[PDB]
Amino acid sequence: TYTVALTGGIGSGKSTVADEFAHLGVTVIDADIIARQVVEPGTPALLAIAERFGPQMINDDGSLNRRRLRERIFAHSEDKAWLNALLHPLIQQETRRQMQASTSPYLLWVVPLLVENRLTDKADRILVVDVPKETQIERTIRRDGVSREHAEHILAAQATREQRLAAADDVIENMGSADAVASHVARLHDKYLMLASQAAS
Numbered sequence: 001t002y003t004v005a006l007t008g009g010i011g012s013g014k015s016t017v018a019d020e021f022a023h024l025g026v027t028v029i030d031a032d033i034i035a036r037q038v039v040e041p042g043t044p045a046l047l048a049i050a051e052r053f054g055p056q057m058i059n060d061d062g063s064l065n066r067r068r069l070r071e072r073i074f075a076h077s078e079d080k081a082w083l084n085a086l087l088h089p090l091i092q093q094e095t096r097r098q099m100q101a102s103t104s105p106y107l108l109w110v111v112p113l114l115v116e117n118r119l120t121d122k123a124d125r126i127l128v129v130d131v132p133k134e135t136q137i138e139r140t141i142r143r144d145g146v147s148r149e150h151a152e153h154i155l156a157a158q159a160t161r162e163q164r165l166a167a168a169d170d171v172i173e174n175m176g177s178a179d180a181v182a183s184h185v186a187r188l189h190d191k192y193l194m195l196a197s198q199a200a201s
Ligand SMILES: Nc1ncnc2c1ncn2[C@@H]1O[C@H](COP(=O)(O)OP(=O)(O)OP(=O)(O)O)[C@@H](O)[C@H]1O
Pocket: 008, 009, 010, 011, 012, 013, 014, 015, 016, 017, 112, 139, 140, 142, 143, 174, 175, 176
């Protein structure tokens, strides 16, 4: 299936832009979303986590207490392997199920480390969601409750803005009015529909 890889730095709005494509009927694959769904309330994986590490891993609303699980892995690095063994097969299975169930003309794959892990060859097209550096920092501080200095450290551990733009086939700036960003998505959607038809012929 024709595949567009969406990437961008922390705070740029990968998920925000992907949602607009989803609204146009595009199947969006995002490993972070899938990882959250495999540990949703009532899931067997969440039960396994609670039975190993304790009922305090479950909040009163039935969801995973993510901070308590991060604390457990921080104190016991060996439990990272256990968590990976539990969750990776479920994430792989659900990724494949979603691919198979899709009936849209193309797939949008959210790939946060596309450039860093050198995956710029798997997708038919690369879309970069871009914002100024200061915008990344401001949106990350707000969402994640980190210091500006912490946000800067994350940026330094990710691909540079220039590297991401160099790899992009198309760039969407997640700035200005939300309506215009959505119109930009609609224009790219038509481009991708036509490229998918061209590939199919
Ligand atoms: N146009 C915008 N103006 C202001 N804030 C925005 C805008 N678009 C998204 N945001 C906010 O910016 C933050 C980052 O957005 P989002 O979660 O889509 O980022 P991401 O690139 O998918 O994720 P990550 O930073 O984890 O890599 C969120 O709090 C989102 O609400």
